[PDB]
Amino acid sequence: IYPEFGTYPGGGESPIIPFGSEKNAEREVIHGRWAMLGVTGAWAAENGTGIPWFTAGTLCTPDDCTAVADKFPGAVAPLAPEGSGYPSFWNVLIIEIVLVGAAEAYRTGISDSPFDDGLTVGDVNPGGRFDPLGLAESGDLEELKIKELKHCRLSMFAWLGCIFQALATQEGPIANWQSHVADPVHSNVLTNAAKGFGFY
Amino acid sequence: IYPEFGTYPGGGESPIIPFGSEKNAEREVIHGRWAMLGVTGAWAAENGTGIPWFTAGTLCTPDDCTAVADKFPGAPLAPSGYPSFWNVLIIEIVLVGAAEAYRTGISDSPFDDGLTVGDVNPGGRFDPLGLAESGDLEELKIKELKHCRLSMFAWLGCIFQALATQEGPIANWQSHVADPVHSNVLTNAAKGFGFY
Amino acid sequence: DIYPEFGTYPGGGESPIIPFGSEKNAEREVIHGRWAMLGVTGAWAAENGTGIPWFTAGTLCTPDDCTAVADKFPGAVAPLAPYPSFWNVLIIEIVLVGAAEAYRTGISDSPFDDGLTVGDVNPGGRFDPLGLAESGDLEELKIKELKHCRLSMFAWLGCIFQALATQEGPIANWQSHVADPVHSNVLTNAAKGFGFY
Numbered sequence: 127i128y129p130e131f132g133t134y135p136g137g138g139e140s141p142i143i144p145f146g147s148e149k150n151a152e153r154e155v156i157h158g159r160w161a162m163l164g165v166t167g168a169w170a171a172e173n174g175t176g177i178p179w180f181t182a183g184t185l186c187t188p189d190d191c192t193a194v195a196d197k198f199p200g201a202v203a204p205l206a207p208e209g210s211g212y213p214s215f216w217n218v219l220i221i222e223i224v225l226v227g228a229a230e231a232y233r234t235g236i237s238d239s240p241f242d243d244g245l246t247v248g249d250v251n252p253g254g255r256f257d258p259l260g261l262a263e264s265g266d267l268e269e270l271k272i273k274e275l276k277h278c279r280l281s282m283f284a285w286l287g288c289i290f291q292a293l294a295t296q297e298g299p300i301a302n303w304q305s306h307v308a309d310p311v312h313s314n315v316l317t318n319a320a321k322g323f324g325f326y
Numbered sequence: 327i328y329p330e331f332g333t334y335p336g337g338g339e340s341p342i343i344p345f346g347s348e349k350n351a352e353r354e355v356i357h358g359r360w361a362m363l364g365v366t367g368a369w370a371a372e373n374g375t376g377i378p379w380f381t382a383g384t385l386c387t388p389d390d391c392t393a394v395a396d397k398f399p400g401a402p403l404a405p406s407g408y409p410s411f412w413n414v415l416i417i418e419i420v421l422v423g424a425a426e427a428y429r430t431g432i433s434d435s436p437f438d439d440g441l442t443v444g445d446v447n448p449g450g451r452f453d454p455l456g457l458a459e460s461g462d463l464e465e466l467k468i469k470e471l472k473h474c475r476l477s478m479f480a481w482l483g484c485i486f487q488a489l490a491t492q493e494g495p496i497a498n499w500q501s502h503v504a505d506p507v508h509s510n511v512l513t514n515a516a517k518g519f520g521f522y
Numbered sequence: 523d524i525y526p527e528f529g530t531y532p533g534g535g536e537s538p539i540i541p542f543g544s545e546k547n548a549e550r551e552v553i554h555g556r557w558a559m560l561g562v563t564g565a566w567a568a569e570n571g572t573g574i575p576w577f578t579a580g581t582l583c584t585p586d587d588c589t590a591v592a593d594k595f596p597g598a599v600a601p602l603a604p605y606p607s608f609w610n611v612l613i614i615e616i617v618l619v620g621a622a623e624a625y626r627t628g629i630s631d632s633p634f635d636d637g638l639t640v641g642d643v644n645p646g647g648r649f650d651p652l653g654l655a656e657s658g659d660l661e662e663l664k665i666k667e668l669k670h671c672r673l674s675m676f677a678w679l680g681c682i683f684q685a686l687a688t689q690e691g692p693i694a695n696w697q698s699h700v701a702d703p704v705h706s707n708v709l710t711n712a713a714k715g716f717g718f719y
């Protein structure tokens with residue numbers, strides 16, 4: 127259901143853009159799960175540490191990646207020994223791209239499917255293996271599907287936000303949010319347009 | 327008649343961007359009217375006041391929109407710092423929200439005048455002179471969409487130019503007329519847009 | 523395996539991303555890319571011959587005059603200028619290119635009328651002077667040109683993008699990258715902030 131605006135892929139069509147390829151539905155949902163994780167990560171990283179997500183791109187560089195050690199709120203220990211440099215960027219990126227590429231190739235059937243029970247390639251939400259808690263079978267899986275997709279679109283809008291705010295304010299989404307909640311009259315996009323977004 | 331590149335929706339129907347729905351034709355002509363009003367409003371704003379159109383909002387302020395009071399040439403817009411930005415905004419939100427709800431039909435009908443909800447240029451009521459019936463309607467809609475498209479392209483130019491020159495549309499007009507060959511787009515790029 | 527790269531060619535198979543139903547854009551991709559390949563190729567050739575970036579090569583010429591190119595070419599036995607004037611080369615450029623466009627798209631009559639249909643992107647009847655069209659099979663050679671066409675369009679997009687980020691020039695960016703690839707790339711230039719941040 128979409129009383130707010132638009133509709134879901136199963137029924138109806140967007141007047142703003144024709145449906146086109148089907149696989150856009152699959153593409154949209156995965157994009158949204160990713161933006162959910164990205165926005166939440168931006169939110170929580172800048173909540174605990176304070177640094178914006180976009181600046182946090184340089185959180186690890188081939189010369190400087192041991193900086194990340196113990197950069198987590200309340201973390202029991204640092205990620206790696208402090209000042210060792212053993213948490214090199216080369217290592218952490220290699221491990222990352224290995225685990226991601228394996229997950230994505232198993233997702234899309236590039237390589238194989240290690241699990242032998244269904245798990246059809248090309249589905250948003252199989253739920254054989256990727257539902258350990260049984261909340262889909264518990265009920266309202268379809269309601270949860272609409273809920274999922276709406277959270278997807280909201281989070282992609284939020285991520286497009288966080289990108290835009292970075293491009294204009296250069297301050298970070300939570301810092302912008304705190305500034306807006308403190309004095310909403312004089313902390314908005316248009317007063318930043320009046321200052322000229324820095325570039326003007 | 328539309329003897330120009332492309333084709334009006336419902337005619338020959340040969341678009342660059344695929345014709346997804348009629349509703350895009352509706353959005354084009356409605357964007358076109360608002361861009362018509364935007365272009366002529368900017369033109370009159372800065373030939374009268376002398377400021378860039380985009381800074382007009384900057385000249386108004388939430389605390390003092392009396393900064394824009396009586397900016398109109400040849401005319402007391404308001405007597406005290408009475409005109410507030412929220413004041414004009416709440417009058418505004420009511421009027422434009424009514425008019426839009428009335429146009430699309432989310433609210434009830436204003437009147438039982440034979441009007442068709444959701445259709446452009448229905449005419450009759452919205453034509454006090456009756457030009458729609460006095461002239462043949464078809465070529466008149468062609469002119470409607472043609473001027474709509476021209477003003478939209480003008481508005482796209484004005485926004486991108488406010489981004490480029492940072493001086494406003496008359497300033498581009500004046501820079502271009504006083505020196506056509508130099509002080510143009512490619513000289514502005516040559517000397518830099520202020521960033522390079 | 524002809525075109526195992528991502529996607530499919532316009533003649534056969536629907537795209538993987540953007541659906542389409544018009545053959546006009548299928549024509550247009552290959553001409554846009556051909557124009558790109560000439561642009562990108564000239565990017566190296568010019569930037570290597572003169573040692574300046576292509577985007578400042580545009581403004582090297584002024585409306586008042588265009589003499590900067592005189593003896594700017596590498597190995598020129600005689601400079602092209604002896605009227606090194608922009609408008610003198612402009613009218614001849616716009617007339618020659620305009621005529622070419624009219625002749626290739628059908629605005630004006632073809633000067634040869636050798637059967638080259640303007641609608642056809644491959645009027646080999648007068649084109650491919652070497653005659654490689656008939657020396658080898660045409661289909662594979664269509665694919666090869668197309669692949670390069672897409673390659674060079676993406677390279678032009680990336681070229682212009684790097685132009686806007688670093689303003690140092692595509693091949694100067696290349697030299698900086700190969701000099702120290704670890705600490706010279708898009709992400710370290712974004713760490714500097716592309717100059718604007």
Ligand SMILES: CC1=C[C@H](O)CC(C)(C)[C@H]1/C=C/C(C)=C/C=C/C(C)=C/C=C/C=C(C)/C=C/C=C(\C)CCC1=C(C)C[C@H](O)CC1(C)C
Pocket residue numbers: 132140141142143156157158160161163164165166167168171178179180182183282283285286
């Ligand atoms: C966690 C975190 C912390 C670190 O510190 C830094 C870090 C970078 C690592 C970071 C990690 C980041 C990650 C993983 C991000 C993932 C992002 C993703 C996948 C975003 C998706 C973005 C999606 C967009 C734009 C879509 C736009 C589409 C739009 C508007 C149109 C929608 C639309 C449709 C089709 C039909 C309607 O009817 C009408 C309209 C036209 C409106």
